[PDB]
From Swiss-Prot:
Effect recorded for S49 to A/D: No phosphorylation
Active-site residues (renumbered): C214 (phosphocysteine intermediate)
EC number: 3.1.3.48
Cross-link N,N-(cysteine-1,S-diyl)serine (Cys-Ser) mapped to chain: C214-S215
List of residues that carry S-nitrosocysteine: C214
Organism: Homo sapiens
Function text: Tyrosine-protein phosphatase which acts as a regulator of endoplasmic reticulum unfolded protein response. Mediates dephosphorylation of EIF2AK3/PERK; inactivating the protein kinase activity of EIF2AK3/PERK. May play an important role in CKII- and p60c-src-induced signal transduction cascades. May regulate the EFNA5-EPHA3 signaling pathway which modulates cell reorganization and cell-cell repulsion. May also regulate the hepatocyte growth factor receptor signaling pathway through dephosphorylation of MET.
Membrane topology field: Peripheral membrane protein
Name of the protein in question: Tyrosine-protein phosphatase non-receptor type 1
Coiled coil regions, renumbered to chain: none
Length: 281
């Protein structure tokens, strides 16, 4: 059981050690499309690339590339799109992806400014009456409503395909209180946020995959989909002993590199799953 494995790693201080074995066992697949010179300004970080095999393709004939990966968890019957925080020049591609993949939710785990630098473009409207038009992808985005809570904000957005005049409602789940350094001291507010995403239906098989991002789309974003998948598997098996968080993480790392960036995020992922287990057992 992971609770006992947790105490062992914690009492032995072996987190940096466990984390390194994960790094060494992780899949390495080609990312040729990400490294083409025409895509250099579509990537926020030169060392974070989607694998070719799992990359999301845009349906535009010109350039189909976006720094996004499809993570398909077969036994949990859950899919996720993990992406980077959009750049000034990829905000239209971001919303095009949301449209094309029939996503109902966007999960954002960063602030636009962290450690005095920009981690993401402002890619949604701040006021109802000031909608955004993405001329490159022919989309319009309107803020419908905003609910600001202590640890996160939920926004109701309307996305309109200006080409066909179809509209959809997108839910934006913005976790606003992830610390500039380390990890949230308790997983309580993170679990409350995750259940709020679940309750919305954004993670349900009747919709396209949820879009999840932070700045790179590997660290905080990894913690979110690792906790969700582990808790779902514990329900499907109704046994918190058959589920190995290290095996789940390695399976997710076949789809996008680098998921879970620090030994701290790994320890936090354990704590989140152990605590969430109480509310599902
Ligand atoms: C709980 C679902 C989600 O939060 C949505 N919303 C919202 O912005 O948060 C309260 C309103 C209540 C139901 C909505 O689906 C639509 C309007």
């Amino acid at each position: 059981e992971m609770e006992k494995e947790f105490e062992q790693i914690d009492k032995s201080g072996s987190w940096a050690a466990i984390y390194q074995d994960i790094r060494h066992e992780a899949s390495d697949f080609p990312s040729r499309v990400a490294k083409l010179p025409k895509n250099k300004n579509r990537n926020r970080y030169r060392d974070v690339s989607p694998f070719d095999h799992s990359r999301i393709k845009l349906h535009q004939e010109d350039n189909d590339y976006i720094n996004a990966s499809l993570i398909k968890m077969e036994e949990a019957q859950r899919s996720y799109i993990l992406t980077q925080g959009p750049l000034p020049n990829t905000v239209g591609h971001f919303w095009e992806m949301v449209w094309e993949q029939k996503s109902r939710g966007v999960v954002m785990l960063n602030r636009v400014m962290e450690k005095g630098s920009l981690k993401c473009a402002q890619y949604w409207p701040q006021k109802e009456e000031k909608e955004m038009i993405f001329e490159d992808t022919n989309l319009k985005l309107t803020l419908i409503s905003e609910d600001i809570k202590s640890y996160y904000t939920v926004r109701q957005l309307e996305l309109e395909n200006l080409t066909t005049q179809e509209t959809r409602e997108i839910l934006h789940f913005h976790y606003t209180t992830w610390p500039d350094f380390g990890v949230p001291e308790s997983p309580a507010s993170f679990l409350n946020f995750l259940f709020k995403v679940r309750e919305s239906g954004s993670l349900s098989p009747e919709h396209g995959p949820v879009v999840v991002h932070c700045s790179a789309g590997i660290g905080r974003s990894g913690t979110f989909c690792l906790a969700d998948t582990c808790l779902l598997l514990m329900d499907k098996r109704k046994d918190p002993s058959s589920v190995d968080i290290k095996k789940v993480l390695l399976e997710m790392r076949k789809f996008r590199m680098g998921l879970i960036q620090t030994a701290d995020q790994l320890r936090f992922s354990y704590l989140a799953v152990i605590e969430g287990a109480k509310f599902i057992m």
